[PDB]
Amino acid sequence: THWFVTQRNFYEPQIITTDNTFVSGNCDVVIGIVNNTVYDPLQPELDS
Amino acid sequence: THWFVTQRNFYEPQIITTDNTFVSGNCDVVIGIVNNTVYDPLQPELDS
Amino acid sequence: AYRFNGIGVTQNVLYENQKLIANQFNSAIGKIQDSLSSTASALGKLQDV
Numbered sequence: 001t002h003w004f005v006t007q008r009n010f011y012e013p014q015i016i017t018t019d020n021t022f023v024s025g026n027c028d029v030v031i032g033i034v035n036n037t038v039y040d041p042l043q044p045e046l047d048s
Numbered sequence: 049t050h051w052f053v054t055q056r057n058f059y060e061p062q063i064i065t066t067d068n069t070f071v072s073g074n075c076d077v078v079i080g081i082v083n084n085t086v087y088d089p090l091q092p093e094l095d096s
Numbered sequence: 097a098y099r100f101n102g103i104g105v106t107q108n109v110l111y112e113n114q115k116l117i118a119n120q121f122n123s124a125i126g127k128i129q130d131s132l133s134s135t136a137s138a139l140g141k142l143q144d145v
């Protein structure tokens with residue numbers, strides 16, 4: 001039901017963030033891509 | 049007296065930060081763990 | 097994606113080129129058949145034994 005990111009050799013699920021991910025191109029370019037929230041720790045830290 | 053972090057193969061110490069470290073779990077689990085203040089490079093940049 | 101990452105070429109270099117990579121691979125496997133169809137001289141390493 002919920003998406004995560006994890007180290008391939010041992011299941012330890014992590015929150016999908018811009019610390020755990022990087023970007024290239026756009027959503028039209030990649031085969032098999034899906035829709036999901038990418039969180040960012042800087043957001044509550046600015047807002048609070 | 050002070051806690052630093054360095055690469056394994058040549059002593060080049062640094063202040064411990066959330067850029068130098070990653071988090072998992074809590075202080076119960078890790079045999080032989082210690083305490084120190086982790087610096088957060090975002091806080092002076094939010095506050096100033 | 098991992099294979100390419102194992103040679104320091106980041107995962108997205110596969111995904112931004114995936115059908116091109118599969119065409120290069122399909123072309124290369126095709127050329128193996130034509131090479132092995134043409135001649136026995138490649139298998140000298142076995143026909144000598």
Ligand SMILES: *[C@@H]1O[C@H](CO)[C@@H](O[C@@H]2O[C@H](CO)[C@@H](O)[C@H](O)[C@H]2NC(C)=O)[C@H](O)[C@H]1NC(C)=O
Binds near residue numbers: 001002
């Ligand atoms: C997928 O993972 C999420 C997050 O851990 C699970 O959702 C949580 O479920 C527990 C009960 O098991 C609740 O206490 C949490 O409040 C839920 N959190 C959120 C963000 O929804 C979810 O149960 C897992 N999905 C499946 C099918 O197991």
Ligand SMILES: *[C@@H]1O[C@H](CO)[C@@H](O[C@@H]2O[C@H](CO)[C@@H](O)[C@H](O)[C@H]2NC(C)=O)[C@H](O)[C@H]1NC(C)=O
Binds near residue numbers: 081082083
């Ligand atoms: C790290 O610091 C914590 C406090 O943040 C220490 O926790 C105390 O531990 C003793 C022994 O179990 C307890 O008597 C106290 O009640 C604890 N205090 C709190 C606030 O939890 C911990 O011992 C320190 N550990 C090391 C290895 O330095």
